[PDB]
Amino acid sequence: VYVPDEWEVAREKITMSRELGQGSFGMVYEGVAKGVVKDEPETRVAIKTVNEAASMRERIEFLNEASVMKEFNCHHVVRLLGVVSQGQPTLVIMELMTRGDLKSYLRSLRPSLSKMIQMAGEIADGMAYLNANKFVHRDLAARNCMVAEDFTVKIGDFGMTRDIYETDYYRKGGKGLLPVRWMSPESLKDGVFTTYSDVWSFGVVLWEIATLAEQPYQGLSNEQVLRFVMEGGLLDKPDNCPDMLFELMRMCWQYNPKMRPSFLEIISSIKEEM
Ligand SMILES: CC1(C)C(=O)N(c2ccc(SC(F)(F)F)cc2)C(=O)N1Cc1c[nH]c2ncccc12
Ligand code: NI
Ligand code: NI
Ligand code: NI
């Protein structure tokens, strides 16, 4: 079951404007919520819906997954603003990131060390907060980073393929969709997901920033990426890559998870030369 709480909003307060994409449990909308925030009468929102076709078990799964976000207070993680458990459809309301995901943003720029370093620090800020709170993201990638009106980068999750980035995922038959080009050697081999496997992924995100979001390991198939990465292979230095940004990547791609820096260590090294 699920017990309604202080996060509950009256369905009458949410109007739905247009659709943004598909989503795991149903349709995702851009909308407006009324008195959901202090000193702000209306708020532009993202609405995640449970498909009306979905079962009882899966409506409660959805609510209990999204309740994890009630614990979070980091301006660098997309913020939950409210739930609607009562009646149909079942909604969760969230901060609207008006400039979309970081991969689309990067591809549309088809920047300086300072902008790349800023974007990196903001990403490392949300991930440090999540990892400290026992939250291992498991799909950290530019496509899951969101960009606000003010150009702030936040950690989100725009499910797992929206079709748009369907080449980013490998179907391991029955298993499911794996983002293999972002996965650490211990994740690929043993299904080990830790803070250290999030740090590996962050290195791939830095490579995505430096290449304006090229596909990692372009011209290797999904199975060749597995073999290459498990046997100690590394992405090449992006063209025009500043030294500092590539040193950070390499730190993140130590084969032994224990030799990688923590997100806190990454924020320190970034701040020390800002
Ligand atoms: C699908 C949805 C709403 C969601 O549920 N999440 C999410 C956020 C945080 C966490 S917690 C984590 F640790 F993963 F970040 C888990 C899911 C997102 O990021 N979404 C996309 C999204 C939000 N705002 C937007 N503005 C414009 C376009 C798309 C979006
Ligand atoms: Ni399920
Ligand atoms: Ni900040
Ligand atoms: Ni297609």
Side-chain angles (χ1 to χ4, degrees):
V1 300
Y2 169 92
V3 190
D5 65 6
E6 319 86 47
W7 289 93
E8 196 71 27
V9 276
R11 185 188 302 282
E12 312 103 313
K13 309 227 93 174
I14 322 303
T15 61
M16 282 157 279
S17 318
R18 65 182 210 124
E19 59 206 329
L20 287 181
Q22 188 41 63
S24 307
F25 297 98
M27 205 77 103
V28 182
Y29 300 94
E30 148 159 19
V32 167
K34 270 175 202 203
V36 302
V37 167
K38 164 158 148 84
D39 266 331
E40 205 180 278
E42 293 167 76
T43 303
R44 298 187 73 187
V45 287
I47 327 315
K48 205 200 208 149
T49 65
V50 192
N51 245 300
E52 317 102 43
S55 53
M56 232 263 220
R57 284 134 75 120
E58 289 280 358
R59 291 198 283 149
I60 285 166
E61 206 199 275
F62 170 87
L63 291 177
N64 288 340
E65 286 171 29
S67 296
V68 173
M69 295 179 60
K70 295 159 170 189
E71 284 290 328
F72 299 160
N73 194 41
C74 165
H75 75 265
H76 279 294
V77 175
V78 176
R79 179 182 168 194
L80 179 73
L81 290 180
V83 317
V84 185
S85 38
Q86 311 309 254
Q88 223 73 103
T90 307
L91 318 182
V92 131
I93 274 51
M94 284 183 196
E95 188 162 57
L96 196 264
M97 312 290 284
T98 57
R99 296 180 194 278
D101 74 82
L102 177 59
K103 177 148 181 177
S104 310
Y105 177 79
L106 288 177
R107 294 208 162 174
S108 71
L109 287 172
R110 300 157 183 258
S112 54
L113 224 204
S114 290
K115 297 308 177 158
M116 296 192 271
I117 271 324
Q118 186 67 44
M119 286 183 176
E122 280 179 9
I123 292 163
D125 184 285
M127 292 303 313
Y129 175 86
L130 291 174
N131 284 189
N133 285 260
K134 289 173 176 175
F135 191 104
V136 172
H137 189 289
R138 290 164 89 103
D139 196 7
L140 174 58
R143 67 186 169 271
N144 282 324
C145 300
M146 309 293 303
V147 183
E149 194 87 335
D150 65 0
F151 296 92
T152 312
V153 184
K154 310 190 181 198
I155 312 292
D157 192 43
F158 206 165
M160 193 165 68
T161 198
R162 196 79 306 98
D163 318 5
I164 165 184
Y165 297 130
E166 72 194 350
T167 68
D168 291 358
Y169 296 90
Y170 185 35
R171 274 234 135 266
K172 222 132 165 208
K175 298 201 84 220
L177 290 182
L178 300 176
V180 307
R181 300 166 191 271
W182 284 263
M183 287 167 64
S184 75
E186 70 279 8
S187 301
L188 297 168
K189 183 187 307 127
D190 277 0
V192 171
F193 294 84
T194 70
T195 183
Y196 290 117
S197 70
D198 276 348
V199 162
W200 175 286
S201 292
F202 173 80
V204 182
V205 180
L206 296 194
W207 191 96
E208 292 180 272
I209 294 163
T211 61
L212 298 178
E214 261 164 18
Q215 295 295 289
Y217 315 102
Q218 254 182 68
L220 298 190
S221 69
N222 293 317
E223 296 271 51
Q224 292 176 320
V225 172
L226 260 75
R227 271 194 73 264
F228 183 74
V229 165
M230 276 185 266
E231 279 160 349
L234 291 179
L235 288 167
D236 297 335
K237 188 171 174 157
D239 295 336
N240 315 293
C241 195
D243 280 348
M244 167 181 176
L245 193 65
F246 179 61
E247 267 308 317
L248 209 46
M249 285 177 216
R250 265 190 94 78
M251 273 162 49
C252 293
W253 301 331
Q254 300 286 328
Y255 200 83
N256 186 336
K258 252 58 166 178
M259 293 296 302
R260 296 179 207 146
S262 84
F263 287 112
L264 280 197
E265 281 170 334
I266 288 163
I267 286 159
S268 287
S269 92
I270 286 173
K271 284 171 165 194
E272 176 200 17
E273 196 92 21
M274 93 184 310

